[PDB]
Write a protein that binds this ligand. Structure first.
Ligand SMILES: C[S@@+](CC[C@H](N)C(=O)[O-])C[C@H]1O[C@@H](n2cnc3c(N)ncnc32)[C@H](O)[C@@H]1O
Length: 240
């Protein structure tokens, strides 16, 4: 819709401009940041400079080899963090986006950024794509996960990740918009003890399916970082 206007803008840039920014993630991000729609507004829902910088710091510190984001929109975070993943040998970035129209646009921006060999966009519901990703990785656990899609799916999709044994000691979770609009359920979940999560999981049906009850035997450590806020959750071991 609106998003097609943005894609048209990029595709209609002069060749000299495309040649100038091609293969330069930071420059492609700036073209996204500086675009204005006819009504005067900008591209929405992008992770942005300040939160983005914080997360970039975590990636440089922890050097995740496998990073997954839930919710890609037009490719901004995939480009920002995929660029960081580039610097890490063997590193791969997976973006799980439900809207095919959005994903197609993100695919072009990611390619223009020079990140096509590093970033893979999976189209479909995150819960479905995670099942498929697990099949592809068995050939195991995720190193870092950026959770940035619909707030009501934070805990259901996290429980899917848990159930697929994609969370292990060393795995870091970064969840966006903890305050605005808010994800209180998620914030509650990742601050729960293993025993608390065991009861929650038995009590609260995963809307994604009975088979995705989750894994309570994970020890979590969570810090909220305020800027709005993001929750930073590390699995630090398996629970007794
Ligand atoms: C905040 S935007 C993601 C922004 C992106 N991470 C960035 O910073 O550039 C939320 C996105 O989640 C997507 N979404 C909603 N439900 C989803 C689901 N079940 N699985 C995957 N993506 C979903 C929407 O299509 C939307 O593009």
């Amino acid at each position: 819709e609106k998003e097609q206007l943005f894609l048209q803008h990029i595709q209609n840039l002069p060749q000299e401009r495309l040649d100038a920014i091609r293969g330069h993630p930071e420059l492609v991000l700036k073209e996204i940041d500086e675009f204005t729609y006819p009504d005067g507004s900008g591209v929405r829902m992008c992770i942005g400079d300040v939160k983005g910088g914080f997360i970039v710091g975590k990636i440089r510190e922890r050097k995740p080899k496998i990073m997954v984001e839930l919710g890609g929109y037009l490719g901004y975070s995939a480009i920002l963090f995929g660029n960081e993943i580039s610097k890490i040998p063997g590193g791969r970035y997976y973006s799980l986006e439900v809207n095919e129209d959005y994903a197609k646009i993100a695919y072009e921006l990611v390619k223009l950024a020079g990140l096509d060999e590093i970033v893979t966009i999976m189209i479909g519901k995150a819960c479905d794509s995670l099942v498929e990703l697990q099949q592809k990785l068995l050939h195991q656990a995720l190193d870092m996960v950026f959770i940035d899609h619909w707030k009501d799916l934070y805990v259901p999709d996290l429980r899917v990740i848990e159930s697929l044994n994609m969370i292990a000691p060393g795995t870091l979770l970064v969840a966006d918009n903890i305050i605005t609009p808010g994800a209180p359920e998620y914030h509650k979940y990742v601050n729960m003890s293993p025993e608390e999560r065991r009861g929650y999981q038995a009590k609260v049906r995963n809307v994604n399916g009975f088979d995705f009850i989750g894994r309570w035997d994970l020890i979590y450590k969570t810090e909220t970082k305020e800027f709005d806020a993001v929750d930073v959750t590390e699995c630090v071991g398996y629970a007794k």
